[PDB]
Amino acid sequence: SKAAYVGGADLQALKKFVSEGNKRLDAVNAIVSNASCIVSDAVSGMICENPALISPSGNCYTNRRMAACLRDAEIILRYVSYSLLSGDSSVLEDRCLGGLKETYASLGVPAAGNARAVGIMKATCVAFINNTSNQKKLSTPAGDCSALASECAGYFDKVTSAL
Amino acid sequence: KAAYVGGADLQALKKFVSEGNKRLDAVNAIVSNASCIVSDAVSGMICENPALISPSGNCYTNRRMAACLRDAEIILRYVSYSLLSGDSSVLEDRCLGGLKETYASLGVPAAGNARAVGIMKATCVAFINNTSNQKKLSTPAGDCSALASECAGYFDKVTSAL
Amino acid sequence: KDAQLRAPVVTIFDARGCKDHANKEYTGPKAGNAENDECCVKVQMTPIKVADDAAALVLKECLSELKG
Amino acid sequence: RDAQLRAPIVEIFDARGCDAKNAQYTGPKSNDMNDDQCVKVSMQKITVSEATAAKKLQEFIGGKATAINVPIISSMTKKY
Numbered sequence: 001s002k003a004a005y006v007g008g009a010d011l012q013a014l015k016k017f018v019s020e021g022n023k024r025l026d027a028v029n030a031i032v033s034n035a036s037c038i039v040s041d042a043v044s045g046m047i048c049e050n051p052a053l054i055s056p057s058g059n060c061y062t063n064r065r066m067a068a069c070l071r072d073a074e075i076i077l078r079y080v081s082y083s084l085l086s087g088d089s090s091v092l093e094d095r096c097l098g099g100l101k102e103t104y105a106s107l108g109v110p111a112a113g114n115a116r117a118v119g120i121m122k123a124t125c126v127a128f129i130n131n132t133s134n135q136k137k138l139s140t141p142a143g144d145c146s147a148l149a150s151e152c153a154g155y156f157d158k159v160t161s162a163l
Numbered sequence: 164k165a166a167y168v169g170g171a172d173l174q175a176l177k178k179f180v181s182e183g184n185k186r187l188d189a190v191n192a193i194v195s196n197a198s199c200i201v202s203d204a205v206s207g208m209i210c211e212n213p214a215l216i217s218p219s220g221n222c223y224t225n226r227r228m229a230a231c232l233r234d235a236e237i238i239l240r241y242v243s244y245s246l247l248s249g250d251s252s253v254l255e256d257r258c259l260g261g262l263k264e265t266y267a268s269l270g271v272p273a274a275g276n277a278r279a280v281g282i283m284k285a286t287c288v289a290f291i292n293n294t295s296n297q298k299k300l301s302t303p304a305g306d307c308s309a310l311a312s313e314c315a316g317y318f319d320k321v322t323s324a325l
Numbered sequence: 326k327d328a329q330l331r332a333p334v335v336t337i338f339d340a341r342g343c344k345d346h347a348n349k350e351y352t353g354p355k356a357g358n359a360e361n362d363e364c365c366v367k368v369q370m371t372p373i374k375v376a377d378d379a380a381a382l383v384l385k386e387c388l389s390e391l392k393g
Numbered sequence: 394r395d396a397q398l399r400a401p402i403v404e405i406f407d408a409r410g411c412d413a414k415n416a417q418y419t420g421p422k423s424n425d426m427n428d429d430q431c432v433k434v435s436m437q438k439i440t441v442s443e444a445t446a447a448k449k450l451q452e453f454i455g456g457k458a459t460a461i462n463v464p465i466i467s468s469m470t471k472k473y
């Protein structure tokens with residue numbers, strides 16, 4: 001539960017422990033600072049493509065179910081963001097994905113809908129990392145983040161595979 | 164408590180406002196992006212002036228931030244209704260009447276509202292004209308600049324008033 | 326699995342040039358350069374929650390954009 | 394002013410090609426596409442919870458990141 005602060009010498013060290021530390025931190029900043037939209041756009045895209053999901057027999061029907069789906073999509077996004085901070089997917093694969101498919105099966109949370117919500121978040125995050133905007137309309141120094149984008153994509157692919 | 168306008172009544176409404184079908188698309192572009200429009204506006208106001216979330220700033224604490232996010236949504240929605248109606252009377256009376264005085268008494272900073280409303284205006288104009296990063300709604304391609312400018316005019320009434 | 330439905334909430338502070346916030350949260354040693362002494366990452370395992378108002382607003386967006 | 398902080402919620406239903414039937418509209422039929430289209434308007438109290446607000450603060454506090462392809466106005470100094 002305790003918040004950790006990594007700055008100064010500890011942040012300098014973290015940048016020696018992971019590849020492309022500065023770019024990595026920019027990528028994480030983009031995702032976390034836009035998290036509500038990334039999540040809402042993914043869940044609402046899943047729904048707009050399959051409106052049955054908010055019909056009365058749909059798994060997102062009622063605020064409570066919508067809230068649970070938005071929450072889970074945020075949980076997944078956050079474990080991906082943390083994977084990108086860390087340079088690996090171990091915590092994502094254990095804490096987030098471990099037992100998740102079985103949990104969803106016991107609750108009746110639909111695999112097709114999850115695949116689409118996750119797929120949209122993937123596209124969105126990859127696009128934030130491979131942002132081709134002019135420098136004037138770009139918050140970070142312009143350059144090539146394709147390796148990190150592919151890394152991020154790989155983390156989403158692990159979620160897709162598990163679910 | 165809700166009004167439903169479909170069938171004959173909607174066919175009629177479309178004749179009583181200019182560019183009825185395009186106008187409904189333009190309204191759709193606002194209401195289906197309501198959460199992110201509000202977010203961008205308050206976020207941008209803050210990144211330009213981070214003091215707003217310093218301990219002495221007007222968005223400090225969840226209570227103040229929640230009120231600002233709420234107010235931004237209120238303003239956005241009265242604008243969306245003005246665009247549906249082709250008329251700003253409700254916006255000017257119900258929303259904007261007494262608001263400048265209200266904000267003057269509370270110390271809600273005018274420069275902050277100027278910027279937030281300005282960002283909502285740019286974001287709505289972009290969604291209406293389909294120049295935004297996202298273009299999720301389907302329309303025949305065309306020139307919606309008149310409706311975008313009408314929308315911008317409603318935001319300009321907000322800015323003028325505040 | 327996480328029984329409490331926690332996830333890592335990460336906050337990224339590039340605070341280079343910020344004079345008004347005292348950089349006191351990070352308690353370790355300094356690096357001797359601005360790229361690290363005026364930058365900080367915050368990480369906190371947090372129960373992830375979505376309130377009724379947020380879910381209700383997403384539903385309003387959805388209802389006006391359902392594809393035929 | 395509105396004492397209850399209500400605002401108009403406008404909802405746009407283009408239900409052409411939507412195979413689910415809805416009949417909240419009680420007026421006459423147009424006998425064309427408008428029978429598959431509806432605008433809903435209601436006046437609802439607008440509210441944002443402090444929990445949501447806390448989540449938004451965490452998104453906003455980094456002070457650098459933005460949506461894709463938008464103007465950059467961020468600053469590290471107090472403006473007002």
Ligand SMILES: */C=C/C1=C(C)C(=O)N/C1=C\c1[nH]c(/C=C2\N=C(C[C@H]3NC(=O)C(C(*)=C)=C3C)C(C)=C2CCC(=O)O)c(CCC(=O)O)c1C
Pocket residue numbers: 034036037038039040041042044045046048049119120123124125127128199296297299300390391392459460461462
């Ligand atoms: C909301 C966060 C975003 C900010 C801020 C920004 O600047 N862009 C953001 C999001 C974003 N979304 C996508 C891709 C998709 N989004 C959807 C959902 C959307 N589409 C719909 O039809 C409906 C319902 C009417 C929605 C709510 C979808 C389906 C996609 C495409 C997913 C895919 O490619 O399979 C992106 C990625 C854009 C890109 O690839 O360049 C961003 C950045």
Ligand SMILES: */C=C/C1=C(C)C(=O)N/C1=C\c1[nH]c(/C=C2\N=C(C[C@H]3NC(=O)C(C(*)=C)=C3C)C(C)=C2CCC(=O)O)c(CCC(=O)O)c1C
Pocket residue numbers: 037196198199200203204206207208209210211281282285286289290294295296297298456457458459460461462463464465466467
């Ligand atoms: C609602 C999320 C968005 C999706 C999805 C999408 O496709 N576009 C989205 C947002 C959007 N924003 C703007 C315009 C602006 N946003 C800001 C705030 C932003 N800039 C910053 O420096 C910071 C803090 C680091 C922010 C949070 C600003 C300042 C603008 C421009 C305002 C103005 O020009 O007056 C737009 C419109 C883009 C355009 O005007 O071309 C969209 C679509």
Ligand SMILES: *[C@@H](C)C1=C(C)C(=O)N/C1=C\c1[nH]c(/C=C2N=C(/C=C3\NC(=O)C(CC)=C3C)C(C)=C\2CCC(=O)O)c(CCC(=O)O)c1C
Pocket residue numbers: 005006007008213214215216217218338340342343344345346347348349350351352361362363364365367454456468469470471
């Ligand atoms: C400059 C951008 C600025 C003005 C002007 C202003 O009025 N407020 C400004 C910044 C600001 N920062 C914060 C919060 C945090 N800043 C942090 C940065 C560092 N902490 C450190 O110890 C170091 C050295 C490695 C940093 C680079 C951190 C970690 C913040 C979070 C604190 C927390 O978790 O509570 C705010 C929010 C209000 C505040 O705490 O001052 C503002 C407005």
Ligand SMILES: *[C@@H](C)C1=C(C)C(=O)N/C1=C\c1[nH]c(/C=C2N=C(/C=C3\NC(=O)C(CC)=C3C)C(C)=C\2CCC(=O)O)c(CCC(=O)O)c1C
Pocket residue numbers: 051052053054055056167168169170388391392393406408410411412413415416417418419427428429430431433
């Ligand atoms: C097609 C998109 C669709 C499938 C397939 C599915 O399973 N569900 C679908 C749509 C859907 N619509 C709604 C809610 C409303 N639809 C409305 C449209 C009309 N109402 C009318 O009277 C007319 C004729 C003029 C329409 C074209 C309205 C007004 C809706 C809101 C009603 C309300 O106020 O609650 C939903 C939401 C679930 C539901 O309420 O049925 C869904 C999933």
Ligand SMILES: *[C@@H](C)[C@H]1/C(=C/c2[nH]c(/C=C3N=C(/C=C4\NC(=O)C(CC)=C4C)C(C)=C\3CCC(=O)O)c(CCC(=O)O)c2C)NC(=O)[C@@H]1C
Pocket residue numbers: 011020022023024025026027029128129130131140141142143144145148337338339340360361364365366
């Ligand atoms: C892909 C991720 C996007 C992108 C990134 C990009 N960033 C840089 C350079 C820097 N980024 C930072 C950022 C931070 N360092 C920190 O400690 C923190 C806070 C914790 C942040 C936010 C830094 C310090 C640099 C170094 C240069 C500078 O000081 O300005 C680059 C340049 C290449 C490099 O690796 O240095 C790039 C390409 N660029 C894009 O176009 C993508 C959208």
Ligand SMILES: *[C@@H](C)[C@H]1/C(=C/c2[nH]c(/C=C3N=C(/C=C4\NC(=O)C(CC)=C4C)C(C)=C\3CCC(=O)O)c(CCC(=O)O)c2C)NC(=O)[C@@H]1C
Pocket residue numbers: 182184185186187188189191290291292293302303304305306307310405406407408427430431432
């Ligand atoms: C700017 C607003 C964007 C744009 C709009 C645009 N729309 C049309 C045409 C139509 N739009 C609708 C939409 C609705 N009618 C309804 O009753 C409802 C639900 C309440 C909706 C959402 C309709 C029915 C049409 C007519 C065409 C059709 O049969 O689908 C146009 C075409 C020109 C015109 O005036 O008809 C345009 C240009 N186009 C853009 O490029 C902007 C992003």
Ligand SMILES: *[C@H](C)[C@H]1/C(=C/c2[nH]c(/C=C3N=C(/C=C4\NC(=O)C(CC)=C4C)C(C)=C\3CCC(=O)O)c(CCC(=O)O)c2C)NC(=O)[C@@H]1C
Pocket residue numbers: 043053059060064065066068069070072073075076095096097100103107109110111112113114117326327328330331
């Ligand atoms: C959203 C894209 C999809 C969706 C989601 C949805 N989830 C639930 C319920 C639960 N989800 C979890 C998830 C986790 N357990 C873990 O250990 C982790 C890793 C940290 C996760 C992500 C759990 C435990 C539940 C049950 C407990 C709870 O919900 O509080 C629901 C149902 C909520 C309900 O039954 O009321 C839904 C709808 N639904 C969809 O349709 C999307 C595909």
Ligand SMILES: *[C@H](C)[C@H]1/C(=C/c2[nH]c(/C=C3N=C(/C=C4\NC(=O)C(CC)=C4C)C(C)=C\3CCC(=O)O)c(CCC(=O)O)c2C)NC(=O)[C@@H]1C
Pocket residue numbers: 205215221222226227228230231232234235237238257258259262265269271272274275276279394395396398399
């Ligand atoms: C957000 C962009 C800005 C901001 C907002 C902010 N507003 C308040 C408090 C109130 N806002 C209103 C507004 C209205 N009254 C009406 O009748 C209407 C039209 C329907 C509106 C929009 C009112 C009445 C209040 C006071 C009552 C209440 O809060 O419920 C606050 C809180 C002020 C305080 O210290 O309590 C804030 C922060 N703040 C900014 O900095 C942005 C510029």
